């Protein structure tokens, strides 16, 4: 009914969505890093183990 | 004010989902280059081990 | 089971719960890959007998019966006299017997109903004269497992 | 401080914010389900509704297999309070609920799979321990044997018995022996024949009665079979005793937690289907709000249910209308149709203290629907003692009373049906018109024989009159322009009739004529079907308001004449005969007396279909009836 609640609940939805949706991103970018840094080092190891 | 939030907020969850898909290009990126890195680095490792024997 | 519980409830980010269910075929198919013959054998021997995943299922107690039995059924008695040497020495209405002799008598439900057989080496040990000791004290849950065990073998012993 | 969530379409978003709103609710804001990203509709919305209903059928499988009856009754809402303490405010999480259940439902289900067996088992060796006490007592010298041929038998009597020795003796001539003896119900049996003909004799047996063999036990390692039998038999008395302590002690403690998880599971099941957790609600409810209710609110947002939106967190006007107007005017209507009052305002008045416990108990099928009504059984109830009292002026003979009668009912109805009219006349609120200009040709010659029924009722001096006088009056209204009287009219007196056929004949043309006029600040066919059914309702209303004279003289004739006709005989013949005759006159009277009573409130539903039909038109189904109850609940 009233006007201020619509923009205070819809300005910390948006606030909440935001901050919810760069936690999300950061965490989707340090589990790809993660799994590039395992992926690189496995190839890396056994090329290592090969040459050597 | 009544129907401009839920105008806003669509925005704002589109935004908020392409934020999550820029990072998942981001990390397929990562994964891309992540053979592209040891690949690089047996190139790398087969040089030092000719000077190696080269040097013996 | 609180990863198969929580593996049915999803949400959004589902990389994650690829991730947990990923997690949850390796936790389960990591822990189930072993022989539960060797497990089996080991916890008997260890004389440490506790309630696991793998321990309450009867495809675990169906492969390990017919390995069991290297000399008159010496894997059952050795287990029924470990639950009635627990009921001997170390005297019940104690919290660490309870769980050894509700283990026990729970396990031994599965042997007496898969295998009929059962019954002559249970009372050629004595564990039916101790499995009914166990249903008149306290441990209701044990005396619950007591009472199964020989609901199994008052079906096998009259029908 | 606690989130609710509420869904319906966007039509009806303004006023069921208003009244969400005017019973505690702030902080409402209108949103959808695609404009966020915490609440998003997925499989796991359906996978949580799987086990849910998985969870439901757990909960009916332990209450199946408990014993006890299934629970058909829900109560979701924070108002009542079976509905908290069945349904608590905070969160609920399905999985705790589900593996809570699933060892309790395990461990019933083998609990009473291992009592049935061991019942089974402890009635077969008590079963048989009677027959081999009885076979073993004709130690053992011939029981255990070889050389002997003994047959053992249990059987129900000696009747099953005469036909087993029938059957043997047609089929095997006579070389058998018929005996019986007599068990704690059971029935001891023995046969004697050949060493050799054992094998006939058990073939002979088998497709014979009830199952008893050469030797009938399960345990002969012992000599003899009694005492291993009587061992075993008390060892699965003790084991079912175990049992039935262990299912009983187990059971006894989850008796509300069954009900109480399977309203938890409702209103989980319901906030799951207000979430849109399917794929086909998405495109039927669009429209989701969202607010936070205080923790003193949430019993005042159960007082009503909503028009369309679903009052659970984790017809429908708000003031009207409603049918207002039904419970005042169905029940001062309904009860003058019956002191025979005073039987249904002492029914009545037991269902007042017999609410609580006539609430939950729902016995028949007529109580159930009275409870419901309760309170306009109570106030028709209350009110039928008045009109049922002044019946049985004076009601002496025919012709005398109906008079007054006549005219009472048309006088009263005219009150409501001006009062209808009036009343849909100030709803529908720059938007005016269409109401003023009707009910004006009604109440003019309504009005005129109304004057005329009063002024006819005083007028003694000559000046009046007796057929009827108003009924001739407005009969004879409506003919004739260039009259006078007739009858009973006073001195004016011909230019009512002209101003009542000048202004009824206006009315017809000036009706639908202010339709478009007064919307402008497919009504052609609205104006005249509006009109005719103005004009057949007009009629409708005072031809059918008739009933009331006709079915209170009904049964006030129905019971006068039983009273009148048993009051004269139980009065005579004092003494014992005066007592007995009386009592025995006055208990078979009051005995019809009180069905006549229920059948005419049983039959004085005339007065809610003509006001559920020819009421609702003029005023704005079965909205009324139940607004009239609801209307005194909130």
């Given at each position: 009914?009233?006007?201020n609640?619509?923009?205070?609940?819809?300005?910390?939805?948006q606030?909440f969505?935001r901050?919810?949706?760069?936690?999300?991103?950061?965490?989707?970018?340090?589990?790809?890093?993660?799994?590039?840094?395992?992926?690189?080092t496995?190839?890396?190891?056994?090329e290592?183990?090969?040459?050597? | 004010?009544?129907?401009?939030?839920?105008?806003?907020?669509?925005?704002?969850?589109?935004?908020?989902?392409?934020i999550?898909?820029?990072?998942?290009?981001?990390?397929?990126?990562?994964?891309?280059?992540?053979?592209?890195?040891?690949?690089?680095?047996?190139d790398?490792?087969?040089?030092?081990?000719?000077?190696e024997?080269?040097?013996? | 089971?609180?990863?198969?519980?929580?593996?049915?409830?999803?949400?959004s980010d589902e990389?994650?719960?690829?991730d947990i269910?990923?997690?949850?075929?390796?936790?389960?198919?990591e822990?189930?890959?072993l022989?539960?013959?060797?497990?089996?054998?080991?916890?008997?021997?260890?004389?440490?007998?506790?309630?696991?995943?793998?321990?309450?299922?009867?495809?675990?107690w169906?492969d390990?019966?017919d390995?069991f039995?290297?000399?008159?059924?010496?894997?059952?008695?050795?287990?029924?006299?470990?639950?009635?040497?627990?009921?001997?020495?170390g005297?019940?209405?104690?919290?660490?017997?309870?769980?050894?002799?509700?283990?026990?008598?729970?396990d031994?439900?599965?042997?007496?109903?898969?295998?009929?057989?059962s019954?002559?080496?249970?009372?050629?040990?004595?564990?039916?004269?101790?499995?009914?000791?166990?249903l008149?004290?306290?441990?209701?849950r044990?005396?619950?497992?007591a009472?199964?065990?020989?609901?199994?073998?008052?079906?096998?012993?009259?029908? | 401080?606690?989130?609710?969530?509420?869904?319906?379409?966007?039509?009806?978003?303004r006023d069921?914010?208003?009244?969400?709103?005017?019973?505690?609710?702030?902080?409402?804001?209108?949103?959808?389900?695609?404009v966020?990203?915490?609440?998003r509709?997925?499989?796991?919305?359906?996978?949580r509704?799987?086990?849910?209903?998985?969870?439901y059928?757990?909960?009916?499988?332990?209450?199946?297999?408990?014993?006890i009856?299934?629970?058909?009754?829900?109560?979701?809402?924070?108002?009542?309070?079976?509905?908290?303490?069945?349904?608590?405010?905070?969160?609920?999480?399905?999985?705790?609920y589900?593996?809570?259940?699933?060892?309790?439902?395990?461990?019933?289900?083998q609990?009473?799979?291992?009592?049935?067996?061991?019942?089974?088992?402890?009635?077969?060796?008590?079963?048989?321990?009677?027959?081999?006490?009885?076979?073993?007592e004709?130690?053992?010298?011939?029981?255990?044997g070889?050389?002997?041929?003994?047959?053992?038998?249990?059987?129900?009597r000696?009747?099953?018995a005469?036909?087993?020795?029938?059957?043997?003796?047609?089929?095997?001539?006579?070389?058998?022996?018929?005996?019986?003896?007599?068990?704690?119900?059971?029935?001891?049996?023995?046969?004697?024949?050949?060493?050799?003909?054992?094998?006939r004799?058990?073939?002979?047996?088998?497709?014979?009665?009830?199952?008893?063999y050469?030797?009938?036990?399960?345990?002969?390692?012992?000599?003899?079979?009694?005492?291993?039998?009587?061992?075993?038999?008390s060892?699965?008395?003790?084991?079912?005793?175990?049992?039935?302590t262990?299912?009983?002690?187990?059971?006894?403690?989850?008796?509300?937690?069954?009900?109480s998880?399977?309203?938890?599971?409702?209103?989980?099941?319901?906030?799951?289907?207000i979430?849109?957790?399917?794929?086909?609600?998405?495109?039927?409810?669009?429209?989701?709000?969202?607010?936070?209710?205080?923790?003193?609110?949430?019993?005042?947002?159960?007082?009503?249910?909503?028009?369309?939106?679903?009052?659970?967190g984790?017809?429908?006007?708000?003031?009207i209308?409603?049918?207002?107007?039904?419970?005042?005017?169905?029940?001062?209507?309904?009860?003058?149709?019956?002191?025979?009052?005073?039987?249904?305002?002492?029914a009545?008045?037991?269902?007042?203290?017999?609410?609580?416990?006539?609430?939950?108990?729902?016995?028949?099928?007529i109580f159930?629907?009275?409870?419901t009504?309760?309170?306009?059984?109570?106030?028709?109830?209350?009110?039928?003692?008045?009109?049922?009292?002044?019946?049985n002026?004076?009601?002496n003979?025919?012709?005398?009373?109906?008079?007054?009668?006549?005219?009472?009912?048309?006088?009263?109805?005219?009150?409501?049906m001006?009062?209808?009219?009036?009343?849909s006349?100030?709803?529908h609120?720059?938007?005016?018109?269409?109401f003023?200009?009707?009910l004006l040709?009604?109440?003019?010659?309504?009005?005129?024989?109304?004057?005329?029924?009063?002024?006819?009722?005083?007028?003694?001096?000559?000046?009046?009159?007796?057929?009827?006088?108003?009924?001739?009056?407005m009969?004879?209204?409506?003919?004739?322009?260039?009259?006078?009287?007739?009858?009973?009219?006073?001195?004016h007196?011909?230019?009512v009739?002209?101003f009542?056929?000048?202004?009824?004949?206006?009315?017809?043309?000036?009706?639908?004529?202010?339709?478009?006029?007064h919307?402008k600040?497919?009504?052609?066919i609205?104006q005249?079907?509006?009109?005719?059914?103005?004009?057949?309702?007009?009629?409708?209303?005072?031809?059918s308001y008739?009933?009331?004279?006709?079915?209170?003289?009904?049964?006030?004739?129905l019971?006068?004449?039983?009273?009148?006709?048993?009051i004269?005989?139980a009065?005579?013949?004092?003494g014992?005969?005066?007592?007995?005759?009386?009592?025995?006159?006055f208990?078979?009277?009051?005995?019809?007396?009180?069905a006549?009573?229920?059948?005419?409130?049983?039959?004085?539903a005339?007065?809610?279909?003509?006001?559920?039909?020819?009421?609702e038109?003029?005023?704005?189904?079965?909205?009324?009836?139940?607004?009239?109850?609801?209307?005194?609940?909130?």
């Amino acid at each position: 009914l009233t006007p201020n609640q619509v923009n205070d609940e819809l300005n910390k939805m948006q606030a909440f969505i935001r901050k919810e949706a760069e936690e999300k991103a950061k965490e989707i970018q340090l589990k790809a890093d993660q799994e590039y840094e395992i992926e690189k080092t496995n190839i890396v190891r056994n090329e290592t183990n090969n040459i050597d | 004010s009544q129907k401009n939030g839920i105008a806003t907020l669509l925005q704002a969850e589109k935004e908020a989902h392409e934020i999550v898909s820029k990072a998942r290009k981001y990390r397929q990126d990562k994964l891309k280059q992540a053979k592209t890195d040891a690949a690089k680095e047996i190139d790398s490792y087969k040089i030092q081990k000719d000077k190696e024997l080269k040097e013996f | 089971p609180t990863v198969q519980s929580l593996s049915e409830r999803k949400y959004s980010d589902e990389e994650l719960r690829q991730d947990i269910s990923n997690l949850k075929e390796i936790l389960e198919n990591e822990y189930q890959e072993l022989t539960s013959f060797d497990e089996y054998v080991a916890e008997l021997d260890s004389k440490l007998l506790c309630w696991s995943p793998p321990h309450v299922d009867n495809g675990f107690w169906s492969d390990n019966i017919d390995e069991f039995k290297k000399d008159n059924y010496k894997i059952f008695r050795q287990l029924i006299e470990l639950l009635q040497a627990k009921v001997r020495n170390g005297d019940v209405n104690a919290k660490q017997e309870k769980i050894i002799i509700q283990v026990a008598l729970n396990d031994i439900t599965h042997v007496v109903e898969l295998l009929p057989e059962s019954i002559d080496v249970l009372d050629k040990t004595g564990g039916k004269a101790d499995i009914m000791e166990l249903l008149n004290h306290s441990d209701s849950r044990v005396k619950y497992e007591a009472l199964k065990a020989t609901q199994a073998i008052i079906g096998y012993t009259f029908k | 401080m606690a989130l609710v969530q509420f869904y319906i379409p966007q039509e009806i978003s303004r006023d069921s914010a208003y009244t969400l709103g005017q019973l505690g609710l702030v902080q409402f804001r209108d949103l959808n389900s695609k404009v966020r990203a915490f609440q998003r509709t997925f499989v796991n919305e359906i996978r949580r509704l799987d086990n849910v209903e998985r969870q439901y059928r757990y909960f009916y499988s332990l209450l199946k297999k408990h014993d006890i009856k299934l629970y058909e009754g829900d109560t979701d809402k924070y108002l009542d309070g079976s509905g908290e303490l069945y349904v608590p405010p905070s969160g609920s999480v399905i999985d705790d609920y589900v593996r809570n259940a699933s060892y309790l439902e395990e461990r019933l289900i083998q609990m009473e799979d291992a009592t049935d067996q061991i019942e089974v088992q402890k009635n077969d060796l008590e079963q048989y321990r009677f027959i081999l006490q009885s076979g073993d007592e004709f130690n053992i010298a011939a029981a255990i044997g070889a050389s002997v041929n003994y047959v053992t038998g249990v059987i129900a009597r000696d009747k099953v018995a005469t036909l087993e020795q029938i059957l043997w003796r047609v089929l095997r001539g006579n070389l058998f022996f018929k005996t019986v003896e007599i068990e704690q119900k059971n029935a001891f049996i023995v046969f004697s024949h050949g060493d050799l003909i054992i094998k006939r004799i058990r073939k002979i047996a088998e497709s014979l009665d009830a199952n008893l063999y050469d030797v009938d036990s399960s345990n002969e390692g012992r000599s003899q079979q009694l005492a291993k039998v009587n061992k075993n038999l008390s060892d699965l008395y003790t084991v079912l005793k175990t049992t039935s302590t262990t299912l009983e002690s187990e059971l006894y403690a989850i008796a509300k937690e069954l009900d109480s998880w399977f309203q938890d599971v409702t209103r989980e099941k319901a906030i799951f289907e207000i979430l849109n957790k399917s794929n086909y609600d998405t495109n039927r409810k669009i429209l989701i709000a969202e607010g936070w209710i205080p923790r003193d609110e949430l019993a005042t947002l159960q007082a009503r249910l909503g028009e369309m939106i679903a009052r659970l967190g984790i017809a429908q006007y708000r003031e009207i209308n409603a049918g207002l107007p039904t419970i005042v005017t169905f029940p001062f209507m309904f009860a003058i149709m019956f002191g025979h009052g005073f039987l249904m305002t002492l029914a009545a008045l037991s269902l007042v203290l017999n609410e609580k416990k006539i609430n939950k108990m729902k016995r028949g099928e007529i109580f159930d629907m009275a409870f419901t009504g309760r309170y306009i059984i109570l106030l028709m109830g209350v009110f039928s003692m008045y009109t049922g009292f002044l019946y049985n002026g004076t009601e002496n003979a025919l012709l005398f009373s109906n008079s007054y009668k006549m005219k009472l009912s048309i006088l009263m109805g005219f009150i409501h049906m001006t009062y209808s009219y009036f009343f849909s006349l100030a709803n529908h609120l720059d938007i005016i018109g269409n109401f003023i200009p009707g009910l004006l040709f009604m109440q003019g010659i309504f009005g005129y024989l109304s004057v005329c029924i009063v002024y006819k009722w005083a007028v003694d001096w000559v000046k009046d009159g007796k057929p009827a006088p108003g009924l001739l009056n407005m009969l004879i209204n409506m003919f004739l322009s260039p009259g006078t009287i007739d009858d009973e009219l006073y001195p004016h007196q011909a230019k009512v009739q002209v101003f009542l056929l000048l202004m009824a004949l206006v009315c017809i043309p000036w009706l639908l004529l202010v339709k478009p006029l007064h919307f402008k600040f497919d009504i052609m066919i609205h104006q005249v079907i509006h009109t005719i059914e103005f004009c057949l309702n007009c009629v409708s209303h005072t031809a059918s308001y008739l009933r009331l004279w006709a079915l209170s003289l009904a049964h006030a004739q129905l019971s006068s004449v039983l009273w009148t006709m048993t009051i004269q005989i139980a009065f005579g013949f004092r003494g014992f005969v005066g007592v007995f005759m009386t009592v025995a006159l006055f208990a078979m009277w009051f005995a019809l007396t009180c069905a006549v009573l229920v059948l005419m409130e049983g039959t004085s539903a005339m007065l809610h279909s003509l006001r559920l039909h020819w009421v609702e038109s003029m005023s704005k189904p079965y909205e009324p009836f139940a607004f009239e109850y609801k209307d005194m609940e909130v």
